[PDB]
């Protein structure tokens, strides 16, 4: 009915974001009636008597949780079933509980996470939590997967003395916490030997579906608490239904009404446009190094190459660069010739004035030159600092498209801010995909506000947070406004080739007020708005126009000479033709080339052998 | 006060900090920048 | 048991093979210890005595069952125990019993099929069968699926009476015959609501796993009776284990280590040589229209057209030809430009003398000319006829490859018999991928049993029936033997061109005894024991060779210039040059070719100005 | 004795044939051929 809300979720891990409040502040903005964090659930540096009553509505944490350095007193995550493990913390654990005392060694006391019964990938680990109650009487055997049960490191103490008691109705005394609604709920370890996986009770009549995570309101597929793998609408499939299936009779291939396609963990019924559609039926961010992307079909796909690829450059944050931070001066070495970053971009501060913790030397701006190759970025472009001594993002301005298939985030394709440019520059930038555009913290930009953003979206939705740019009457004071030569769709700055649209015509890749009709140095014509030179052959008309076309065969006077429906410098003297017999021609009375006489071998001034003489 | 090693690790005015609890070292950002070595601004709030 | 023993099934419905006797010989030839029956089961004209015992070891029947027309008593089908109906009798019913009764109204009595549980598809007719006994009381809505029992027509006449009954333990009087054992074996109807398909009894811990059909011997995937539909070795899948699975977190496509392909209804490791491997994970027997068959390094793949593929010709008895049994005067039109038949090819008597019952014209022998395109055929070739005034199977004289993706009776991929000709002519045929090759009944047929056929097979088991054609003794009698430019390979006739393989070299399509090097007109080089003419260029030398190579870089002497390394007839004079600057030559001493003066627009028959007169 | 029709229904010298029983028409094919009209040489089986 209702789709699950979702957050980001942060990953900082023992790093404390400001003070205790703006630390909690900012814990309470990413979770604040959150019900499954797709990334990590990470509680840390909570104080006493803070209200984490919010911690309620999360359901499921897709990364791991980690909660330490707490000297707050009870954390609720109550409503918290299941902990995926997508990521570990320490490269270990789906869940670490650590060191939640305060310096009088009261801390944590109480976690009530009753309806934790399962823990896909990953091990667990408590460690030096003195007021923690009741949580050392889990059979943790139950929650979590055995191929991890090893790699299980945890100890309590009860240094407080003020825990309770679990209520007889806990099963083997377990319990998270106090009252009959804390008790341990085993959906694991008590199963029929014929039970697949989870299951509601200890009768065989009770097992859950093999694709069910905690547990289960019914045996069959649709009656899960939570999907194992895919999510397809109501029920929880092990696979998303195949485009195509494999006709055993006619060892042929056939479709599949009930096809869906593959995109994350759900299963749905198309591809969002920004991705990549794959035979297969799934939605993916990349090709394999055997292909590129075709669009035109009405969607991105993925098509093999003729002979060798074009090189594919991993944007700063996958493979080759999963930790590398930002483009440094170390990586930069494998973004030579770029035109597609199949990733992210991240201009960093720390880049420029060099990271010694990192090892790597300070980045010369000279070298960002580099980037001019690029074309489309498929991820998102994040820059928080840029050379002073350049006054625009010069580096992008051949960028074309920013696809968003990630953003930082996962919200924001496009970030400008704590820069000192005066204008943007991206000339070429005509789509953005996905994803939402900040551009501020800039002092010196005056462009920005004037560009038509709503026109350069392609999803539902795509906001565009422009502010604390000094200059919405200031920069027009110092004249620094969109050209006259710029129609009202905006401008990336002053210079006529800065503009979106043209008011008039066009000179290639800068805007103008006429066409060279009639007079001007080059002769041209005119069609959709762009400017032309006619083919050198066409005789400057001072009167009226001077050509129809790009072609020779346009003009309405030649400069020279006339071979047929062309307009020719001078008359052919040596070209191929049939039989492998050469051509010579001449010039007549109107300037017209004919065909010379065929025995005329060098040539002929004149018609026949009255023309080429000895 | 952190080692010669974490010098600098900490970015956008960070202060680094040893977790003596924890045997671990952390950043102590500034407000609005966040990540493990404070390397983000937020963007999702303001500027 | 692991695998099972496989028949291919009849197909002639109410069609009598030959006498009584002749009949049930061929039904008991067909059905001896099979245990899969992968087409029809049609037992009929089975008269009385004879035993029908060998049908106790059939336990699947993938098609329908036909049990008309049988005065014999008893038909012990008790260890069948599915119907697939991958095909239906009178475009309705998997399973047809059909007046079974003697002259005297006394026939088939007793049809013990205790263990037939399931019948995927189709529905069931019974009629006209008085000694019929206990059948009449079988509940067939859990035999049946529910979208068939509507095309049920099917009722009992007891107008005799020696039937005895149900023993009392049958659950509703249910019996296929005397006995306890003989008690329909409900497995569907008794199931429990939290069963989704099959199950072992009524209590929900017998519930069958979902990929069932007959029922089951445990809840789990590897404790089916039969697969309902594909079999992945131990145990029942709905879809073989696909070649790469989704990552629903990297957003990316990773590879399935338990990675199986689709062939027929079983799951492979990999694909049969001959048949073609998509990117699916599955075998095929066709591209589709959209792409060609692609070699790979050692497996048949399908890629993509660059445009209007080549016309795919769909073989007689499939598409477009279900019904036509050979090639005739009015399909003959759909073969006209073809390269590769995607089918099977039937040559029949009745194409050539006209079918009055098709309404179809006798074919005009001088259109099989139209094959001659035909390069290779995916199926198998049939031919049990032809033009008598040919003597020679010309029309597939460009016929390179035999797949055999599928054969008659399912075993031979090459059939020529009863025919008249002389000589094969296959002088093209270079492979037959799989399926055996017989060549009988050809009375004065020579060459047939020369072919190294070790050669073009290219499978495992592939054998060779040719008997009953001329004598060896008599061919090498009339002097109709292999020609001694003919390798040991053999002949596919008299001519030098029938060779397999060559004794010394070839021209092109022919052998030779050797290769035109110190005479001969047209002089040649030896590669490959293959014979190719130099470059004219190259002046014929009555002592030494001639040249080393196709091109002119490997001529000893040039017959009239040298440009260079390359021999050339005249010297350039015309070719585009450098900055425009088009390029004079002229010859001298040796005839070699050197640059004229840049001043000689008309060329120059000597060096610098003073070889350019006026 | 089958109709007009059918004549020429069964091949390789097969005669036609009215089942009254089913009410329809058959073919009586010669040993050595199958087929629903005799019209498939028994491959696996002599020449
Ligand atoms: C182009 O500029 C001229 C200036 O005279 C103006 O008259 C005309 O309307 C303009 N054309 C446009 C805006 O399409
Ligand atoms: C939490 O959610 C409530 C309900 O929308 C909202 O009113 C409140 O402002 C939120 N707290 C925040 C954003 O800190
Ligand atoms: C197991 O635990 C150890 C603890 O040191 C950890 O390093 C490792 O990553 C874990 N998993 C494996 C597969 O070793
Ligand atoms: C620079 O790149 C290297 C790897 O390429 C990485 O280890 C380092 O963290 C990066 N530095 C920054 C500041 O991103
Ligand atoms: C059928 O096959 C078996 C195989 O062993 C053989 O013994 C038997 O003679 C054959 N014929 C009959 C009628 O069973
Ligand atoms: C079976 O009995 C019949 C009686 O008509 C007889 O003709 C036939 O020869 C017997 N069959 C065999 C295989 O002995
Ligand atoms: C039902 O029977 C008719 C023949 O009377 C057949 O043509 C039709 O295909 C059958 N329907 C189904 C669903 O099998
Ligand atoms: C057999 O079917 C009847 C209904 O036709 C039902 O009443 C009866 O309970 C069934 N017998 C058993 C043993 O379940
Ligand atoms: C000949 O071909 C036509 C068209 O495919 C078909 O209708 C007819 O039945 C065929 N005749 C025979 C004898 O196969
Ligand atoms: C069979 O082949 C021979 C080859 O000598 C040919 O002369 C004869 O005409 C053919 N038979 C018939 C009936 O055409
Ligand atoms: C074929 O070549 C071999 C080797 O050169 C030679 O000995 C033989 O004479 C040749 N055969 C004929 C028929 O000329
Ligand atoms: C077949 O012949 C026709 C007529 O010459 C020609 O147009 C066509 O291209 C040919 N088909 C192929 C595949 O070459």
New interface residues.
Partial sequence: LEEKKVCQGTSNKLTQLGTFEDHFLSLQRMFNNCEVVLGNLEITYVQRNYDLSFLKTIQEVAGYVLIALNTVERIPLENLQIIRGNMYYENSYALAVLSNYDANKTGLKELPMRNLQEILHGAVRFSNNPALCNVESIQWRDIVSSDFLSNMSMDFQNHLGSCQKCDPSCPNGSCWGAGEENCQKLTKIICAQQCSGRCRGKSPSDCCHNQCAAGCTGPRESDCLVCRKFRDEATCKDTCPPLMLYNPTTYQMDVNPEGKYSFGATCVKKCPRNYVVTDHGSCVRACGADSYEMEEDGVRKCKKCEGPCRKVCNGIGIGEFKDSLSINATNIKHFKNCTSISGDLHILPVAFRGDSFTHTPPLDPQELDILKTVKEITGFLLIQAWPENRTDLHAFENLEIIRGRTKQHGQFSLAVVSLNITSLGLRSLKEISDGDVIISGNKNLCYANTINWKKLFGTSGQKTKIISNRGENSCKATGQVCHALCSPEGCWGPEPRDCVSCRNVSRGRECVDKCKLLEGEPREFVENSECIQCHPECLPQAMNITCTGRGPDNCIQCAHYIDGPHCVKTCPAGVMGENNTLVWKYADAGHVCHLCHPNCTYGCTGPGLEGCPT | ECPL?????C??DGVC?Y?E??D?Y??????G???????????????
């Fill in positions: 090693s974490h010098d600098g690790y970015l956008h900090m977790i609890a924890l671990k952390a950043c102590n950002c500034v407000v920048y966040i990540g493990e070595r404070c390397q983000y601004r937020d963007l999702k709030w303001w500027e």
